[PDB]
């Protein structure tokens, strides 16, 4: 019973974990895309040029 | 009961966390875009030139 309850509990906390991590990954990627498009996609290539 | 209440509670605090972080990411990206467009998109390339 304890391994079972701990199993479903950990399953919940873990799916919640990958969920929130996926969310922060989403806002991060979206923010970075909005910034890089705000700056100019070819301008950074000039910066590395 | 305690793992459950802690689970929904942490889920709330975490979704709130990624929410506020997404908000600060939004005001940050918007502010940076407004500044970089205020300055001139090609001017920075000249600065790196």
From Swiss-Prot, chains A, B:
UniProt PTM comment: Phosphorylated on Tyr residues after EGF stimulation. Dephosphorylated by PTPN11.
Domain of life: Eukaryota
Cellular location(s): Cytoplasm; Nucleus
UniProt function note: Required for normal vault structure. Vaults are multi-subunit structures that may act as scaffolds for proteins involved in signal transduction. Vaults may also play a role in nucleo-cytoplasmic transport. Down-regulates IFNG-mediated STAT1 signaling and subsequent activation of JAK. Down-regulates SRC activity and signaling through MAP kinases.
Comment on protein domains: MVP 3 mediates interaction with PTEN. MVP 4 mediates interaction with PARP4.
Subunit annotation: The vault ribonucleoprotein particle is a huge (400 A x 670 A) cage structure of 12.9 MDa. It consists of a dimer of half-vaults, with each half-vault comprising 39 identical major vault protein (MVP) chains, PARP4 and one or more vault RNAs (vRNAs). Interacts with TEP1. Interacts with PTEN and activated MAPK1. The phosphorylated protein interacts with the SH2 domains of PTPN11 and SRC. Interacts with APEX1. May interact with ZNF540.
Protein name per its UniProtKB record: Major vault protein
Taxonomic source organism: Rattus norvegicus (Rat)
């Amino acid at each position: 019973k304890v391994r079972e309850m701990e199993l479903i509990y950990a399953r919940a906390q873990l799916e919640l974990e990958v969920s929130k991590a996926q969310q922060l990954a989403n806002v991060e990627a979206k923010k970075f895309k909005e910034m890089t498009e705000a700056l100019g996609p070819g301008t950074i290539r000039d910066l590395a040029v």
